Structure 1
Amino acid sequence: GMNNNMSLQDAEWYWGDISREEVNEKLRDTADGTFLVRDASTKMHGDYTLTLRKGGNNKSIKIFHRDGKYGFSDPLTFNSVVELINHYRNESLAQYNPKLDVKLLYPVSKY
């Protein structure tokens, strides 16, 4: 019984662990809505870093992973950027953090 439930590993927007330099290439044109997920914010509840464009600049708005999962609006159970992004871009980014309301509506990927 091969139960092949592939929710999220490599979305056409998602990265995981990168720098500013490939955030320079993806956050080039933009001023709003541009997710990717870099490193450089790893300590308390959150390893990788949902860097979002705000008025021309790459602002690191890091995920609530806790140990390694996904769930910001959820009690640490969502487990997929693809559904932790469907629910968030079609609603509000004041459900994640109420200091911004954009809603991840312009992410990039190289070409």
Structure 2
Amino acid sequence: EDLPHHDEKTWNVGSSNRNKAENLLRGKRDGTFLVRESGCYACSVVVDGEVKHCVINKTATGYGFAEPYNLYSSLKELVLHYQHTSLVQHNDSLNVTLAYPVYA
């Protein structure tokens, strides 16, 4: 019953790239997502039938999608927040939550 997001291996694919992310998310439902590393981090998430990508900033104050909200202490804390809060506030093309970990 607890969210699958609590196991970071269900969504953090480690060192990867945009193409690999597209192949992993192809055919997945809206809200399926992953976090990838290498520009250190990014989020790939399915929105309205398309795979979308955005940067995850790693700053002095924490992780986030945009200032003044780069304040999450870890990637897991970031993911848990955006599991219930839409990314739409940061981008009108990203009206989605991080609902389904790619490997859950």
Is the shorter-chain TM-score for this pair beyond 0.5, marking a shared fold? yes
Match of 1:84 in 2: 78
TM-score of the superposed pair, with normalisation by structure 1 = 0.63
Would you tell me which structure has more strand in proportion to its own residues? 2
Distance in 1 (alpha carbons) for counterparts of 2:10 and 2:95: 23
Would you tell me which structure has more helix in proportion to its own residues? 2
Which residue among 35, 53, 60 is the counterpart of 1:60? 53
Distance in 2 (alpha carbons) for counterparts of 1:72 and 1:60: 11
In structure 2, stretches of 5+ residues that fail to align are 1-5
Contact (CA 8 Å) 1:23, 1:58: kept in 2 or not?
yes
Match of 1:35 in 2: 33
Identity level (%): 35
In structure 1, stretches of 5+ residues that fail to align are 1-7
Contact (CA 8 Å) 2:30, 2:48: kept in 1 or not?
yes
Deviation of 1:18 (Å)? 0.5
Distance in 1 (alpha carbons) for counterparts of 2:22 and 2:59: 24
Distance in 1 (alpha carbons) for counterparts of 2:81 and 2:70: 15
Pairwise CA RMSD = 3.1
Structure of greater Rg = 1
The alignment covers a number of residue pairs equal to 97
3-state SS of paired residue (1:61): strand
